[PDB]
Design a protein around this nucleic acid. Sequence first.
RNA 1: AUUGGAUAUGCCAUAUAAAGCGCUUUCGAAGAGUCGAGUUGUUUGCAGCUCUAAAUGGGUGGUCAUCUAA
RNA 2: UUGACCUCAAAUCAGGUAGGACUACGCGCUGAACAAUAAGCGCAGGAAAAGAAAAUAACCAUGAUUCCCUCAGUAACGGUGAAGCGGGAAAAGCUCAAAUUUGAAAUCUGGCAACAUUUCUUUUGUUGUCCGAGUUGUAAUUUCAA
Lengths: 116, 166, 73, 49, 400, 67, 98
Amino acid sequence: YVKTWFNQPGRKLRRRQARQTKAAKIAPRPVEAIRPAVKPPTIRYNMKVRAGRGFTLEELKAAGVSRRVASTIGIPVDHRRRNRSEESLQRNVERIKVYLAHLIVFPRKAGQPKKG
Amino acid sequence: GAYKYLEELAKKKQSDVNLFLSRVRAWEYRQMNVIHRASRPSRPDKARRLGYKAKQGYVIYRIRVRRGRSARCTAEERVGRYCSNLRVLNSYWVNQDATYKFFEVILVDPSHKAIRRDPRINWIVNPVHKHRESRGLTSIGKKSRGIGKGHRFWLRHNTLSLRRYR
Amino acid sequence: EIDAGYSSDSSTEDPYPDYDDFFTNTVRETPLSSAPEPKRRFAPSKHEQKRILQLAYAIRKGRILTSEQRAER
Amino acid sequence: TFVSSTMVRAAIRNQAAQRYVNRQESKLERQVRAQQNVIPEDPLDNVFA
Amino acid sequence: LSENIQKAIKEMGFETMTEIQKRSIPPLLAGRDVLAKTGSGKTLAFLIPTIEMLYALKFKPRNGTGVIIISPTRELALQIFGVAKELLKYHHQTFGIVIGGANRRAEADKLVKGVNLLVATPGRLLDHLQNTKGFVFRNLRSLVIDEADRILEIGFEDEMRQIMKILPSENRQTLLFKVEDLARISEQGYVVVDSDKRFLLLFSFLKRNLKKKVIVFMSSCASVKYMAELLNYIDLPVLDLHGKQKQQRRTNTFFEFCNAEKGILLCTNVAARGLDIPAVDWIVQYDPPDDPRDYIHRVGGKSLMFLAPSELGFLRYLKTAKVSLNEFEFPANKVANVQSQLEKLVSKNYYLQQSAKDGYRSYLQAYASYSLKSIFDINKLDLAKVAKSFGFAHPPNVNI
Amino acid sequence: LEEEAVKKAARQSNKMLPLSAFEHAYIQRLINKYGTEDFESMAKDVKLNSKLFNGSKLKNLYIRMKA
Amino acid sequence: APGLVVGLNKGKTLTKRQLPERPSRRKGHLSKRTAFVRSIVREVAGFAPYERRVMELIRNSQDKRARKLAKKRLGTLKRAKGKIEELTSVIQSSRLAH
RNA sequence: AUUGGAUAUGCCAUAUAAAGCGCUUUCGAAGAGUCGAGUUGUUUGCAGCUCUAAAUGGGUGGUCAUCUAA
RNA sequence: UUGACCUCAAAUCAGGUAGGACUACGCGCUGAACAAUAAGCGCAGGAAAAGAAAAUAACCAUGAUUCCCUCAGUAACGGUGAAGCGGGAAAAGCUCAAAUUUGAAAUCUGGCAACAUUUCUUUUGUUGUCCGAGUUGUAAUUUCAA
């Protein structure tokens, strides 16, 4: 049982081509969703900062975005992560606020029945 | 309302009510064929909570397997092979005695338009689910092959991945 | 202080009692539903009020024969 | 009589934890010297440029 | 005072400071530990500085709780909460109350999301300060204790020692209203009527004396709303001291009853606590008072007692009180049995039913919150009979 | 892209809804009987409040009937 | 400019927040209704044959063997302790009612 | 020619309706021959047999943390 | 009695569906040599399986699964031989059972009638009516993140 990496330049170009069709389908929105900033859970890397999965419910409510719409404007949700330190709430709320600063939202046509 | 009460009456399987029923039901089931249709589930609340809904296309078959591979996992392979067209949803214990285990197996008709048009049970019409009792993709199949999240739950070892630049 | 006394049953050396109603002997004086009563059980049904509206839909557009049309038909 | 065998298990963890921080510090300390230890401009090399 | 606070005080008509408030409110603005007579406008005395204090720090639901006010009983906690909601209607701070006998699963999630101003019973406060998670009570800026003598007489000895230890006393002023030890750490008429016929008898009594001035005292503000709604709904127009829980309406209704030579009014013990009793022909206490020694002092027309046949220990209490007494008999044949129509209307109607259960729940909680357990015991009283009085053939399922 | 977002929102500006005939006469029957301020009291009545609306939704109908 | 800046650190200043309650942690609370449902079914289904013999031992007052029998049948003391307390609750209730 | 997701615009809308956030003096159901134990095979789990449960419980980790199976 | 309801059957009763083939990849059962190994048997797809924690961890804590790189030939075992961590690819979340719609089974297959519709006279629907399914529970509702 042996594996060869001859398709390594083939697979990389397939991935790039897979990104370009995604960009074609969804033009204005970025090819990647926003991710939060979290700290690795170990004494070795705890002083580091990296990306998370999504923004917890305290990070959404504090920033001012409901949890239902957040999934629609590209902000992802992590029901499992929680905020134990306020610096973790702060680094990710401002991460949301800077995102909503640059976020153009296209209006959608809405059904308007004659009566009500 | 009722399936709360039926939940805790089925939790005591050696009490007099159940043991008196275990003898009465096992005697009459052995009188029947090995695999036979059942109109209403012998355990309505268990069939309910396992996915069964009282509507057309939902079927139930009762099977006895000799004691002495899993017994319940067997009941699913034998029922499905009997009803070749139905997709097996689930299975549950109904009764047992000294020489047999009686199992009920729920099946779905992939062709019935009450099922095919049901937004929630549509997933079973897809061919990838052909005979899930045969591949080990049911609940007991998932358990009997040790699939799950945990620390208590091959070729990645033997392989020799030689990268392009090595 | 156990005195190291050994039980006499150590491994190292009516079938039909009457129905005992110990729980239902006394009648409960309150219900179990602690939840407040909703509005549905006191307001006209919204199930038919929805069905009525789409019946008016079918009447207005001529989808279904009317009651007076049914009698003459 | 010493700690525990799994308490010496953490002895690597108090040995390995200060690896990543040491390595990151070595990266910036090397770069800081690089800014310091650079050759001056040689003002005679802009005659033609 | 702030602009927001000044405008709200006009809604209830609260403009002139009380005699106690004259030397308290001006001093309480400095935020110093300051340690009144019955019904003397105290409610605003320890509330005006607190709401101003919250606005000074610009409190938010994020900032936890800053002010905690402690009440001897449930009913008093209701009175302060009612005033707090009216004067904070023009502010962005959060007003809340946690009390004994309430939904502590709904008394907790409210605190988790952020509560700044809180009025609480010592029993429920101790539970939250020790067992509730997510409640941010490290940032207390004000602590208020009202009627310490009543608090100590209830049986809150170990509660004050435990609770006040938890409260961070640094950077905080304390308002106090054995007491020094706590500050060191800083004629009668009665009718023997059964519970089931209690409501029926009073309805007949109001029917007979419709052309006389009658006032009835009950143990719940929720009961006041229910009976007033019920009586006005059976073609018995009755004034009450609840309205829409508006203090201005209560003052207007009380004032209107004063000039009116005839009428029937409903209010609680704390509702009339401190108010001047006008010339009234008939005064009645429907439920047993929570302050028996204040009941004898308040009376000192003609007085009436509505007592159950199993709570006659209060009559013996009058012997120990050296107060003369007399009994009034009633033949049950002439008591109107409108009970057949009453419960039928309750089941038919929605809002009337909801008032009854809330009044019923408040009646049982207030009874369970009594002090004289050797006189009034919840276990001795039959719950089925009490539920019949409220208009329920069967008791509603209230958690204790 | 941003300019089109403003214009698309400009077209979709009329978010206020009118009233149909049923709720129209529904609100007049309540208004002319229980004034125009005690919305809680008018939600407490059941003889005219057939659907048993709450105070919050009655106020919404009152605002919507204006325009 | 929305941009993640990873590496080094972001901040050493710490402030713990008293975490709320998650409703999945609430599992295992005794619902008031279901206690009644479990009790009523316990009365109806009767008692297990081995569990019936435990009652007689308690009535005969050989509690030591009652623990031994339940422990043997169930598997651990805490499982046996709860059953014994469950059984003795039945016995006292039947004796006061009957 | 055959289709796909969008835009533009015409018509029809059964809306007396349906949602999100908010506040709660009212509530909050949670998967059994399963988990678990003894014991025997298979290769730690899985399987048979013997018994067989609980309701701040139950599993797992370090009096705590995390998780919420059938 | 009638006749309901339950079971029992039959019919060239209508509408269906299953089998065998392929097997590189894939999911199971099972298996000796020389090792979950060949084989044997069973079941599938354009991928299959897995999957939104009864998951780690002891941290400033992380956050469905899958694959890659490292962790590492390390721990552990006694040569066999990993997993968190970290870094990348990709990302998306959800539906039931347990609630009385109870002021109204609101749900659905099938026959028939017209209306349509098409990769299509070869497809797939709607409306109306009738009959069944269903109250031993089909819709809405709610899934712990609540």
